[PDB]
Design a protein around this ligand. Structure first.
Ligand SMILES: Nc1nc(Nc2ccc(S(N)(=O)=O)cc2)sc1C(=O)c1ccc(S(N)(=O)=O)cc1
Length: 294
């Protein structure tokens, strides 16, 4: 827009590019996402606009949604670093458990909030988690693709991560529940602990099979209805579940217990954000300040 001064290009999210920009008028620094054959996604646009009322300390504030010149601009409050960069920067030492615990706790508070408002994120991943120098972490760029959907790339060639995708989505569910967000966050929690992506699939089937190899191929006993899912194949290999102590060493038992509930196959058995906040893993949670290099 003419009212903004592009500072730098931040990310190449799907559907658009994200820029750091300054409001020529107010001088305020923001994150600006620019989106976009025709048709006018009036319905999608409505939904996106509803997100403006989402106000919570752990959700990135959406300041404005501007439709103009066959382009859609989303203006967000700016944060200085995402969790992906922080994890990469902390790869040699690892993130302190108290900090990991604080971030997980805050993100569950954020999800408990948006889920109570019937809002799903749908695409949680480290790049969509932003941190500041004060020790806060926030949920960014809600997808609610229940309106705009999802093609195959951003809009102009670029690989999309499947690493945090819930199994029900990979099996073609059609109707996601808030449980898909808990799954993605469990995957992120594991990654912060081990400093390695939990399920790094390079294709939908590889993603699904990496999940099966670790958690066991699901069946009707652990996930009623799984064999009737759209993309389920009786021909799927049958892997036995691995011992969990092998999955996230050296996470303590409270942590492993919580992770196991965030990773239940059955969406109905998977723990809710509200219940997770009450898990004993958070008994001694605090709010440490991270060492951020900006
Ligand atoms: N609010 C906000 N702030 C940001 N800043 C920032 C600063 C430094 C770094 S970094 N790689 O550590 O130097 C990364 C981000 S980004 C962002 C978003 O609201 C947003 C919008 C869209 C997407 S998406 N799904 O990728 O399109 C992701 C985040």
């Amino acid at each position: 827009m003419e009212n903004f001064q592009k500072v730098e290009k931040i990310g190449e999210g799907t559907y658009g590019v994200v820029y750091k920009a300054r409001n020529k008028l107010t001088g305020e620094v923001v994150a600006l996402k620019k989106i976009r054959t025709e048709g006018v996604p009036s319905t999608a646009i409505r939904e996106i606009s509803l997100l403006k009322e989402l106000n919570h300390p752990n959700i990135v504030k959406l300041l404005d949604v501007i439709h103009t010149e066959n382009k859609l601009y989303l203006v967000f409050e700016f944060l200085h670093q995402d969790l992906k960069k922080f994890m990469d920067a902390s790869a040699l030492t690892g993130i302190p458990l108290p900090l990991i615990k604080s971030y997980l706790f805050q993100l569950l508070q954020g999800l408990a909030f948006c889920h109570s408002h019937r809002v799903l994120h749908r695409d949680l991943k480290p790049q969509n988690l932003l941190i500041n120098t004060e020790g806060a972490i926030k949920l960014a760029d809600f997808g609610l693709a229940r309106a705009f959907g999802v093609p195959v790339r951003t809009y102009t060639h670029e690989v999309v991560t499947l690493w945090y995708r819930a199994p029900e989505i990979l099996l073609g569910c059609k109707y996601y529940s808030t449980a898909v967000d808990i799954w993605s966050l469990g995957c992120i929690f594991a990654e912060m602990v081990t400093r390695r992506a939990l399920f790094p699939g390079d294709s939908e089937i590889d993603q699904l099979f990496r999940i099966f190899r670790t958690l066991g191929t699901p069946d009707e006993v652990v996930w009623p209805g799984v064999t009737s899912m759209p993309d389920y194949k009786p021909s799927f290999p049958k892997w036995a579940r691995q011992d969990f102590s092998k999955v996230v060493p050296p996470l303590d038992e409270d942590g492993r217990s919580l992770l196991s509930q965030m990773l239940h196959y059955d969406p109905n058995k998977r723990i809710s954000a509200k219940a997770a906040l009450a898990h004993p893993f958070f008994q001694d949670v605090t709010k440490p300040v991270p060492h951020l290099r900006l």
